[PDB]
Symmetry: C2
Subunit: 192 residues, 2 copies
């Protein structure tokens, strides 16, 4: 019995048929007779294996049950994008000497997403800079690496006398840029 993929948060309705087993039929393991109990069941005469409730991947990502030659049953729970990204802090801070060459790493911001970042992009965060103030000696003096969140400086006019500090409104966007966006602030200090 090849593993069974079941998207979390399904509509159904329930109870809901998964795969028929090919002589009375009964199923066992963590999910059926062991806790969490009664999540999966089986029509004893027809053998249709059943799901009784919508699943929550974050709670339980898979199951290993047994049909009754003991048939192995693997239930893999595929992800849905039911968690929004959140920066770990409201304000991030970092600094550089004014003489740093373009490319210099200022800081690394981070946003968390409880969804799956292995097989899907639902937990994959895309970073971007919303805006910069002040815009002196010009705008877009900093980049943020899309996946690492490393803020770098790419300008050459860093002058503490003129501008001792830059505030960056930054963004974190799940589904690797296509999904929900959250916002935080990164304050760059030009060191004396």
């Amino acid at each position: 019995v090849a593993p069974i993929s079941v998207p979390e948060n399904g509509k159904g309705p329930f109870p809901q048929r998964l795969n028929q087993l090919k002589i009375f039929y009964s199923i066992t393991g963590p999910g059926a007779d062991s806790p969490p109990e009664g999540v999966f069941a089986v029509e004893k005469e027809t053998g249709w294996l059943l799901l009784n409730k919508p699943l929550d991947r974050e709670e339980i990502a898979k199951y290993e049950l047994f049909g009754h030659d003991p048939m192995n049953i693997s239930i893999i729970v595929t992800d849905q994008n039911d968690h929004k990204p959140k920066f770990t802090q409201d304000t991030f801070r970092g600094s550089v000497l004014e003489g740093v060459l373009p490319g210099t790493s200022v800081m690394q911001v981070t946003a968390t997403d409880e969804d799956d970042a292995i097989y899907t992009y639902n937990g994959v965060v895309a970073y971007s800079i919303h805006s910069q103030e002040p815009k002196d000696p010009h705008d877009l003096m900093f980049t943020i690496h899309r996946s690492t969140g490393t803020i770098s400086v790419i300008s050459s006019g860093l002058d503490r006398e003129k501008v001792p500090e830059y505030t960056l409104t930054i963004q974190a966007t799940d589904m690797d840029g296509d999904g929900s966006t959250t916002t935080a602030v990164a304050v760059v200090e030009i060191l004396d």
Copy 2:
């Protein structure tokens, strides 16, 4: 055994799905191959199969809105060209991912209602759309809401919207053109039945004599 494959996967690719296996187990060496829309006809090359190991392969990420389902055929053929069994009905089901934000059909909606109607009465209906699946997942299911009301007169919270259908209603006596001829409600449609992504429009309700 239909294979459920979420669209928009990270892979990497190619990516194993299931291992095919014939009836002639010990007897002879067997070559596997697949045919159909998705394999050797348009769109070609999307799925493959490892000739000897029989592993069924996905070569690129899928898009349910492009193609929701594949119906392929797997073929067991000995090194001598001979076959013993019918083709294998391989059914790939592309499960939906929430890759479409809800969109209101209009940015401003326009309704009217008589100043002296029973509270509960329908005023108008708004509608946002979502191209994701609404049958097997909530990804395409929109949940409506009223963010805010202006003016607050006679009082606040005079209307309500239906979560499913988007039918706006009056839930108050004391509508009077004389006092308040028109209201402006900020409305929102949010997919995943309220848990996903939100979009915003405005419903402008006129009061009638």
